[PDB]
């Protein structure tokens, strides 16, 4: 049984705004790490959001991209994982 | 040639206990990152353990879940990677 | 459409040297996280580099391994992701 993992790497100023999008979309949780990077090196944030459906991962990704992709640094992608143990998913 | 990657995100108080489980099971190493998150946002820890067999990844995951899943925050999952270069695996 | 994700976990002293290899090879960016670990627990660094081709991921991995694998702690691997949104890739 595959589940989906959405990653969003973006500017630290978006921590609250992106966390709200994740929770309002119905994700059961999220993990965020402090990171740094260079793109198109400075401190930024990396979100990981596990979802039971591709649709939910897409909905979160699409909302973040629609709101912030044009005005903020951002990279995002999805992959699959298995053998999930979670308290509420 | 695929190898396995076990992820365990759990409470920081379990750092030593989970590290011991990983090493006693025979993993060749582990990586741990400081993180934060929300689940079922506060600081926590994310372990990544690469293993040569699914069996070893399962054994570590099963022991952590059996010991701590009922009493501590925890999410865990497995995925595959390739092109491994490691000193001892 | 799959894209590739190269991970390199290595000693913090190599931060600049590995960042230079990544950029000189033509990657569009990279992310780096502070981590800790044990191998063959101390602070180290984890790079993640997304690439449009397996060839580019291999070229970066091969250069890092050729330069530093014999003299420094290092583990590296590759996996795939999808649903990429990036500003320049
Ligand atoms: N090819 C890549 N591999 C890994 N991480 C990347 C890559 N490209 C961008 N990133 C990450 O995403 C962040 C944002 O990138 P981007 O939106 O291109 O603008 P910026 O150059 O301001 O970082 C970077 O700081 C980096 O952390
Ligand atoms: N759907 C999810 N996606 C990403 N990370 C998650 C998810 N659910 C939980 N987590 C991570 O696992 C941690 C533990 O979650 P959980 O055991 O549900 O309880 P808690 O609410 O105390 O965090 C969270 O703090 C978060 O880091
Ligand atoms: N099996 C593994 N799973 C996850 N991370 C690992 C594993 N083996 C090594 N690592 C990571 O790579 C780093 C370097 O490992 P290695 O080169 O074997 O030497 P060291 O023992 O000096 O760390 C470790 O500190 C750890 O972060
Ligand atoms: Cl990570």
Q: What is the distance in A from the centroid of ligand 3 to the CA of C14?
A: 15
- Integer distance in angstroms from the first to the last C-alpha of chain C? 13
- Integer distance in angstroms from the first to the last C-alpha of chain B? 13
What is the helix (H) or strand (E) element at residue A45, kind and residue range? strand A42-51
Q: What is the distance in A from the centroid of ligand 4 to the CA of A55?
A: 23
The answer to whether B78 contacts A83, with C-beta atoms less than 8 Å apart, is yes
Length of chain C equals: 89
A46 forms beta bridges with A9, A33
Domain annotation for chain A: domains and CATH numbers: 1-89 (3.30.70.120)
Give the number of C-alpha atoms closer than 13 A to the C-alpha of residue C34, restricted to the C-beta side.
Answer: 9
This structure's resolution (Å) is 1.4
3-state secondary structure of B61: helix
The answer to whether C29 contacts A46, with C-beta atoms less than 8 Å apart, is no
The answer for residues whose C-beta is within 8 angstroms of residue C8's C-beta and 6 or more apart is: C18, C46, C47, C49, C61, C64, C74, C75, C76
Give the number of C-alpha atoms closer than 13 A to the C-alpha of residue A45, restricted to the C-beta side.
Answer: 18
Q: Which residues line ligand 3 (CB under 6 A)?
A: B 27-31, 48-50, 86-88; C 9, 37-40, 44, 73-75
User: Percent helix, strand and coil across chain A, each rounded to 5?
Assistant: 35, 45, 25
Nearest to B78 by CA among C39, C29, A85, C43: A85
The answer to whether A79 contacts C81, with C-beta atoms less than 8 Å apart, is yes
DSSP code, position C10: E
What's the rounded Cα separation, in Å, for the pair B66 and C35? 26
What's the rounded Cα separation, in Å, for the pair C58 and C32? 18
The answer for residues whose C-beta is within 8 angstroms of residue B21's C-beta and 6 or more apart is: B60, B63, B64, B67
What's the rounded Cα separation, in Å, for the pair B21 and B24? 5
């Amino acid at each position: 049984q595959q589940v989906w993992k959405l990653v969003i790497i973006t500017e630290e100023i978006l921590l609250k705004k992106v966390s709200k999008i994740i929770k309002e979309a119905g994700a059961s949780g999220y993990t965020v790490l402090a990171a740094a990077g260079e793109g198109s090196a400075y401190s930024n944030i990396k979100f990981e959001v596990l979802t039971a459906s591709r649709e939910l991962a897409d909905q979160i990704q699409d909302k973040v991209v629609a709101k912030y992709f044009d005005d903020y640094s951002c990279i995002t992608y999805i992959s699959t994982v298995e053998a999930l143990r979670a308290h509420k998913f």
